[PDB]
Ligand binder design. Structure first.
Ligand SMILES: CNC1(CO)CCOCC1
Length: 166
């Protein structure tokens, strides 16, 4: 059973105009099997539009490619991003954590998606009581992109609602 193709794609921006289907493929095949690899071009001039996409056989291969950033492809540092589900942010809202979820619950779970820089457990401005949601800020957007395409997040026994924040 193959993961949906949308979740196996990487959009690559900032290409050198000299990058070709073949040179993009040779580069990104270092991190997995590519079922598709396309440089986008003008339909009339054939001049590169400066971006393209690669499709891996598995999500773990996408992860490997993202973990190998920065990618310098044909002399230029490119910008890979997972396909849209792009709203490129480093912060998530985590809701449904109730009053008993602490910083270490959130850290122990989310640190396996990426490097955490800030955890903000929200409290009532008047009483100081926990409001039941939090924000987590990572050092990079791919953490967030992995998180929000999951159907489920279980933290401290709570089924949480997680979305991109600002
Ligand atoms: C769309 N499904 C979710 C709802 O926000 C997103 C990931 O976190 C919880 C499940």
């Amino acid at each position: 059973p193959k993961e949906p193709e949308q979740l196996r794609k990487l959009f690559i921006g900032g290409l050198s105009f000299e990058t070709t289907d073949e040179s993009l493929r040779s580069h990104f095949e270092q991190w997995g099997t590519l079922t598709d690899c396309v440089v986008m071009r003008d339909p009339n001039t054939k001049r590169s539009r400066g971006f393209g996409f690669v499709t891996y056989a598995t999500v773990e291969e996408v992860d490997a490619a993202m973990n190998a950033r920065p990618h310098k492809v044909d002399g230029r540092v490119v910008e890979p991003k997972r396909a849209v589900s792009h709203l490129t942010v480093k912060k998530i809202f985590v809701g449904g954590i109730k009053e008993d979820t602490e910083e270490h619950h959130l850290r122990d779970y989310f640190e396996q998606y990426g490097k955490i820089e800030v955890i903000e457990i929200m409290t009532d401005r008047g009483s100081g009581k926990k409001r039941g949601f939090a924000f987590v800020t990572f050092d990079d957007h791919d953490s967030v992109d992995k998180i929000v395409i999951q159907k489920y997040h279980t933290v401290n026994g709570h089924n949480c609602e997680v979305r991109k924040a600002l």
